[PDB]
């Protein structure tokens, strides 16, 4: 089956250019259809950016076709997006999609890739444990990191029930995120419960055990 996966930088400085790729498997970009580039967020607003057809080029870009360029590498089977003189207004998550012919619709979409345009510097998170309250709900606090995202698992992903990871809130160029996990009173503190945090952008990974302090 056809999958489609995006790639590119997570953070880009203002006025620089942005480059993203879309790799497709299970189908060749030369056979048929036009595999496009679309962007969404933050307020859910969407914008179709352009497409490149199976015959190459024949591409179109919305009227904002002045800083954009979509190209392809038929030997590696992937198309690319080049946006220039990027600004803060360009932070969003990008999706590459395939437009089915005849039936005017997009039938295959990628996983999406988020791009932040900011002069702010990457900052590693401080991970704090939160030892527990009422039938034992424990927590983890990840604060002061930039940019998004961080990955948080409880006990190497083994524990998934009762978990609630709350979305990151930006408080002056820095982010703060948290998570709670509810377990039975008999489980903890005898059975260890550690919080696993990973922040790729600053290459930070830390395991924080919730001790009954």
């Amino acid at each position: 089956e056809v999958q489609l996966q995006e790639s590119g930088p997570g953070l880009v400085k203002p006025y620089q250019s942005l480059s993203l790729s879309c790799t497709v498997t299970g189908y060749s970009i030369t056979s048929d259809y036009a595999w496009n580039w679309i962007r969404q967020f933050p307020g859910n607003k969407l914008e179709w950016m352009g497409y490149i057809t199976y015959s190459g080029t024949t591409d179109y870009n919305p009227s904002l076709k002045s800083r954009i360029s979509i190209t392809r590498d038929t030997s590696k089977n992937q198309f690319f997006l080049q946006l220039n003189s990027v600004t803060t207004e360009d932070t969003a998550t990008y999706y590459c999609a395939r437009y089915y012919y005849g039936y005017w619709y997009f039938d295959v979409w990628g996983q999406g890739t988020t791009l932040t345009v900011s002069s702010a510097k990457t900052t590693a998170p401080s991970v704090y444990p939160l030892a527990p309250v009422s039938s034992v709900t424990l927590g983890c606090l990840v604060k002061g990191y930039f940019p998004e995202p961080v990955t948080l698992t409880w006990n190497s992903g083994s524990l998934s029930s009762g978990v609630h990871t709350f979305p990151a809130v930006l408080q002056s160029d820095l982010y703060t995120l948290s998570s709670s996990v509810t377990v039975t009173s008999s489980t903890w503190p005898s059975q260890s419960i550690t919080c696993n945090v990973a922040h790729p952008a600053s290459s930070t990974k830390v395991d924080k055990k919730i001790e009954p302090r």
């Binding site: 704090y128 709350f166 302090r213």
Partner: protein, 210 residues
Amino acid sequence: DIQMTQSPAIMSASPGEKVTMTCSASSSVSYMYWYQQKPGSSPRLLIYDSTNLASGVPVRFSGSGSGTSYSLTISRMEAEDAATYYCQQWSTYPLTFGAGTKLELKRADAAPTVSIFPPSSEQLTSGGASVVCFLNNFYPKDINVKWKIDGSERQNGVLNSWTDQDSKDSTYSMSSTLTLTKDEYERHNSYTCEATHKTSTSPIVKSFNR
């Protein structure tokens, strides 16, 4: 270059109800398209050409409209219909989409399980102090939390975050973090987190003293 407005932005419905969302176009469009986007999954085409149902789409969905007004209706709502729906057009175009309508599932009221956390010693050594309050598994996403330090309501320095509706039980959760300086924290004694929700006339109070 038509702008598409989907109203209502969000709505809830219980299984068995008749649902109807709308898509307005700044100027006439010749037949709209509707996509359904289940949380945590690719969008799927639902309706093509204003009324034509795509294959694999349940008969309960219908589409209608003409000119600058288009609507999506679900005769009978099913749990599995909770998702975001987008309208799209291509007539007088560059093609454009709408910002979607989030159809959430209505369910029985549920009060939150509140938990409070003093700041970790590790954090204190750095000179900062955050008090966290978790309010978990409650229905009307609408809840008001209050932070009180020695009786006074602290309204600044708080960050609130809710999770999307829970896949397994149509419930919500939220966290409220009160960040302070170590020295303002130690200059006080009681830290309270108060929740006011539809389920209780009196608020839920969770506190701790240093």
